[PDB]
Ligand binder design. Structure first.
Ligand SMILES: NC(=O)c1ccc[n+]([C@@H]2O[C@H](COP(=O)([O-])OP(=O)(O)OC[C@H]3O[C@@H](n4cnc5c(N)ncnc54)[C@H](OP(=O)(O)O)[C@@H]3O)[C@@H](O)[C@H]2O)c1
Lengths: 498, 498, 498, 498
């Protein structure tokens, strides 16, 4: 029997585990330490969650090590590993409303969006990677023969072993799922650190691994701080790979910690300041819809959000006019209400950062067309914001807001290379977009954009089969697609002479 | 007109550049600083070589950046890039006797071996990777469709950009070639730091890039110290990838430096303590020949060298007797003499370490069967060495010698899992081997060995098509084969809606 | 309401459809023509089954064409096609006992075996290929650029369209499933012709596609003759691909019919005379168990069955003695008896062929050690048979029996090339095997055997992930694994200039 | 010493072999039979060429078989096979002017074009496939384990063995090179049948294999008739694969012959009636240039030639006007004159077909705008032809001309699906094209076109890396790219239990 926080909400009964998950059981942290998790809709405490300590990290890693080296997970067929992951996806689907409701409470995710994305994409991710298990293949290689003898060379794709996953708060279940699904499909075991502010779907997911029959110790979950729990994971001599998602500055630190301990493998999914270039020959009404989505999707708490819009001179004023018209139509409110399409920011400190961000934009001389403030209601709601007359040297032209702030610059009619130069003038390189009906412009621009993803006449169109990762200081390694598996596999070369 | 150090040796007239190679020209370092490169056969100075300074690194990176962004290398077809690399291999082959002679002088490489391996494999490396240029392919991916609209998702494989390569001294030209060929095949430009003690084949290679018509700035070479030149390469804001080969401890520092600057990508080819397990049912005479090769090849200056031999009890004494017999037949001498089997160690500091290594092995109680000493002759020669009665707790059971020291332990008749545990009880995981006629043992042992390469009834059988890289603290990433290309490529995902 | 033949048997009430399945409906054939399907355990008529006519073939192809061109199957996401195929596998699993019982009745498959293989592997097949749907990918290719313009070249993997599948009677559901799963996973629609003698699991399968929600017309099944139904399929102008499994001689005719009509694509999975080479250094008792299995599995009605055993001279007589001892322990009887090891042959005409085959073997001078005749009891049971003193010129050394007849020749110790020559002296090339503890022999022999599959120290180890197909007159193309998809996909190259 | 036909022409002294090439030597055919090859510029006899007989085919196949089974080609490293093919390309490059001159004489190929395409692309083809030799790789596959035992499954890519190549006359050297390069790269040996009318570059190529060091019997060349030599190749019991390029009707017969003998593998590169759709929103001047090229390139003797142009109503009249203007500027003349841009048709029988084709076009009611006739001069020149008012029911809307005949229909402004339906209403499916600046339209049309290749805003943009093959009655299998190798390889699955 597991202890739950129980809550009647959204036409169901939530049963939320709140403890650490280690070796297939929910357990208190050392000293029974706890912290409060906060509902961004009203600022209330949802419940108390165990606060993992260093000794809890060591217990989690030891359980993962034992599960990998001696448990059933390391013994079963890849096909049967696949079956278990497909079953886990099924169990997640059976609990989809509950999961999406927890995400609405914990992260401020609009419930209808959470059902399709936060939860829906997580389910797709597990099903996708479950199909990879028995299709992960090595090679046989035609090497030079040591005549008069013969040689056979093959490669074997093997698991890396114990992995650590450290993730942010914007899509709590989805960020966990991207990495966890690829990690488990490759045959590894894992210790996961959700962002401290958003532990609840991670702990519910943990319970679901029990319902699915995932062997004890394969999945371990440690609500807690990066500076304590995350650090220890990065430092641990039995951890062999870290999958990290978060800010560029913490990514640098994580990579350093991997180096100094045991040169554990690392992937880094970091910040972005993604440019969206909108040409005059696009479909304008569609550009407004997609451009708004590129910024405002999930209250802007979206790594790939367009952090800069470049709009061709001749359509700029009309584009801005239409955006403002549509922004006024947005329904801001409780993420559980069906008419809501703009939920609260994830937590109070982030709301404060956004308010300060827009003050700097005003101070430095950008035109605040609308928004810029907290919405005067309970919780941590921020107004959908539009800036114009943004110049390349401005702070808001350079810094990632990670909020619902559309930051608009002009470019001269007929310019192409000039705007590309401006769009590429960043140490980030996560995503980018271009709206145009012109085939030649679209292909040329996608060639020249210095970013890991280029959207053409769309935005936010991610897919579990399509690899996702950045260039430059947005990091390296992929989530999603076949490419993601490579972060969680090692290649052993075997060479015979006969 | 290039300045050479001219030398008449080995029935050739060597013409050796000695300056920095920056932007397609040989130039002096800042302040015309130089250092001496030492011939390990007699301890004499070969010549003075330019000593790169920080401002020289900045010039080399600037030249590489220009070559990539604006030069011809970034504009030509993949097919034509391949043609240039195949021409480069042809030029290397035209100069093969000269290159092997330089390697004999600089590194102490036995000339006949340098023709086949140090230089021979370097030529094969460029030809192999030349073939990859127009065969590097992205993907088209069947993503979910945004109905009633359609989506197309593709990936493009692109160059990473400016790379730094930092290498050691054991196979100076070949270590350079592995990384350089894959790096250039993928369309990058490069700044190479050879090991300070072995700059000469790198500088001759530089001149050969001119003969082959590699555009200026594509290849740049900076003899100098790791703590100065290598450090700056790892720190540089315009460098996007470091390919590193060296010790585990420097690898840790390199990775930290990549992290702290601009999270540049990194590959780490580090140290080894590779186990070779020899069962009683092997071919004994072959096991002796291959066992000796596993240790003594290239005077033991071989990262994959077997650093422990485990020999089954019933054949142990006969194995040792036969090795001693064969060791006594080895001809130690000038690497340029055709009858030489065993050349000098690479440099004096390394010889000193090997002497100390064997002193400690005797101190801690291992049986010194033969060798262990500097050979009484000029230069830095070390006697092929055999230790027996080695126990798992001993320093020589744990520490990488990187010299010609065969380190032998017994295991009990029939004790497969037990010997495997002993073989795996190391934080290294570079290579390994097993000698047995039994198919079931061979396959089971190769599954269980925790190493990036497993040799079965052979050793030292590397091939330009077979990926090479370690596990655990032997690093990550691959040199050679198709896999090596992934270190020098980035994947861009392009998603259309239409 | 679907009409069923109802039967109380094996603790179940079987509900067996018996009509043609066209466009999602069970329908009588033209003129309500029918034929009898026979139970091989007692020779009784199970029921009457609709007998497809030419107009019925045209209706099925029209339904398949409409389903492909305009129906839902052609419009849904690859991922969603995958979901439907997974659901089909789940439905088959929910009905596995019923399917295995039907296969016992219709094909004489031993019930316990049919659960694991005839049905269990069919289920694995659908689940395996379900996972491929959203992982079928094309390429982007670095072609030469038409300067000063640019080029993008990509490939798209597309379905071939309407396919015809024609199969034999030995594993009715499994042969169906292998091809159908790959065919549908690739996005095609299909008309299936089961062997006339074994229509029943195919028709139950058809009903399961309805339960699974496979869109109407995607799957169509036409019990009937090869010379009428199969012929029309191969001739039909709207069929673009035939997947054929059967005899070499019918395969020749089928390929010709494809040629003469519309050059439709064809795969050919044909006969075998597979050699198993057993060396004196094998584990003898294991060689006996696996050698017996290589021949007697599924009453010899197994295309990959070892059709000759070459047994090394020094172990031959002991091998034969052990085989005879084990053959005598085999329980022959009703496929529903849970201790049955050997069921009846599939149908009466095959039994008669096997009696004649053995008369011919004795006549030409082979030694009949045991078996060779019909078991005196109702139905069509044939004794497990062993021949020795078989020589290379003999009819039974050349001709495929497709029955439980072990055909043994000696070979001399210390020649390997000589036994290979004898093993390779056939126009078949489907499978082969080698039993030896010697790694060098195993690897060399596997290199030299001229067969699409080589088993080493095992036999009949097929797997849904491992491609299966023959060489020479055993045909071409693969069932199973990733390679099977290529028979059901076409590649479109798309080249842009911009 | 080889017998040559010597010819002083194009400022060169041509040395043309004229005999059969069998087992590394030029020999007369059985009975010294010969036939005349005809210069299409003036209708004169170039020289007498040996006429291969059945016994000569048997000798070639025996030589290919011995070279494969016992000769050096079957023994050398894949890497060394690649070196030989690169060397072959180099020799071809050293002879490029001579080869292009021979092609001008034999096939009427315009010299400047033959240099770039006929010969230039043949060279690229051998270099490209030379690079594949040591990069052809099999797999290791994660199959279900027969617990308590373990299984390893791998695939080996092997050569198919002796191949027959049967080709047409439009690009004699290039068609040979496409197939021969892939065939040899995969490790096979080959007997080549050039079109009887164009044997000369094939025989010169044969001599170049000698210069390049290709082992005797690896390449064998038999000038002669399809009905005799081609037939025997398709019939031969030792040939295991036919690579065929030619008409759809001969393709059907070839496939039938493959079936009836030994089910040898076959690829079919057959005819085309490829549609080019030109929208009003294209760049009109570029559409005219590329539209011209799509029809007139290599005097229309181009399998992928656009056989229908569909031009949008609003630009149709202007397109036709501009085409007529450009057609009038074409210089018809001797292929060796530098100002010629339209050479003679390949041979007399083809010229006659083209005359009849245009007669039937006029008869059935199409508007003949220009050409349609043999040019009044010696040889077999044909006037570049333009037809308009072509309706879907007409012969020239359905039948492949394989000549310089532009066949134009209108489609209504704003129609897309309607014109696609018309473009797809053919049993051919080789190539196609679309000209439009609209990204949505270009992507949609490329999805919907039922053809193996789709060109977007270009035409005739083939590449050695880009796979090329048809759908429907245009055949199956690819030439060029990685995909081409699959036709010349077989996959062996090796499964161990241990
Ligand atoms: N590229 C992508 O796929 C992607 C996706 C989502 C978000 N992001 C990026 O993430 C950022 C937003 O999240 P954030 O600013 O909250 O990120 P953050 O501060 O970098 O935190 C990310 C995670 O790192 C942990 N952490 C902090 N210090 C650590 C340490 N010393 N050792 C180990 N772990 C440590 C944090 O723990 P705490 O819970 O204690 O903070 C948290 O779990 C944005 O820049 C956004 O673009 C990127």
């Amino acid at each position: 029997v597991i202890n739950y926080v129980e809550k009647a909400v959204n036409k169901l009964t939530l049963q939320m585990p709140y403890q650490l998950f280690i070796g297939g059981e929910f357990v208190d942290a050392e000293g029974s330490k706890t912290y409060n998790t906060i509902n961004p809709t009203d600022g209330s405490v949802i419940c108390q969650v165990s606060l993992a300590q260093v000794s809890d990290v060591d217990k989690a890693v030891a359980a993962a090590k034992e599960a990998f080296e001696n448990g059933l997970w390391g013994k079963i067929n890849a096909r049967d590993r696949g079956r278990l992951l497909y079953r886990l996806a099924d169990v997640m689907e059976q609990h989809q409303e509950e999961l999406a409701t927890i995400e609405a409470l914990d992260a401020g995710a609009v419930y209808t969006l959470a059902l399709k994305t936060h939860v829906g994409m997580s389910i797709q991710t597990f099903r996708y990677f479950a199909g990879w298990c028995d299709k992960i293949q090595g090679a046989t290689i035609p090497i030079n023969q040591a005549r008069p003898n013969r040689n056979l060379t093959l490669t074997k794709k093997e698991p890396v072993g114990v992995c650590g996953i450290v993730i942010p708060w914007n899509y709590p279940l989805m960020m966990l799922s991207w990495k966890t699904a690829a990690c488990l499909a490759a045959g590894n075991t894992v210790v996961i650190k959700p962002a401290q502010v958003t532990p609840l779907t991670a702990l519910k997911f943990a319970e679901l691994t029990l319902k699915a029959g995932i062997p004890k110790g394969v999945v371990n979950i440690l609500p807690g701080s990066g500076s304590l729990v995350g650090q220890r994971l990065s430092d641990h001599p039995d951890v062999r790979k870290i999958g990290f998602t978060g800010s560029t500055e913490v990514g640098k630190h994580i990579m350093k910690s991997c180096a100094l301990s045991n040169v554990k493998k690392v992937s880094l999914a970091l910040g972005g300041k993604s440019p969206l270039i909108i040409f005059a020959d696009c479909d304008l009404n569609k550009a407004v819809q997609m451009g708004m989505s590129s910024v405002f999707f999930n209250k802007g708490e979206n790594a790939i959000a367009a952090g800069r819009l470049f709009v061709e001179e001749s359509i700029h004023n009309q584009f801005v006019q239409k955006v403002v018209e549509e922004v006024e139509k947005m329904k801001i409110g409780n993420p559980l209400e069906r008419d809501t399409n703009h939920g609260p920011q994830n937590h109070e400190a982030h709301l404060r950062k956004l308010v300060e961000y827009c003050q700097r934009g005003v101070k430095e001389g950008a035109t605040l067309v609308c928004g810029g403030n907290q919405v005067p209601r309970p919780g941590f709601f921020f107004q959908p914001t539009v800036f114009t007359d943004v110049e390349d040297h401005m702070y808001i032209a350079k810094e990632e807001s990670f909020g619902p702030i559309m930051i608009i610059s002009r470019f001269a009619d007929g310019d192409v290379d000039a705007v590309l130069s401006r769009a590429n003038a960043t140490e980030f390189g996560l995503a980018s977009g271009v709206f145009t009906r012109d085939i030649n412009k679209a292909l040329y621009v996608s060639d020249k954009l210095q970013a890991g993803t280029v959207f053409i006449n769309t935005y936010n169109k991610t897919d579990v089969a399509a690899p996702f990762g950045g260039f430059k200081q947005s990091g390296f390694g992929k989530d999603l697609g076949e490419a993601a598996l490579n972060e969680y596999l090692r290649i052993k070369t075997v060479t015979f002479e006969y």
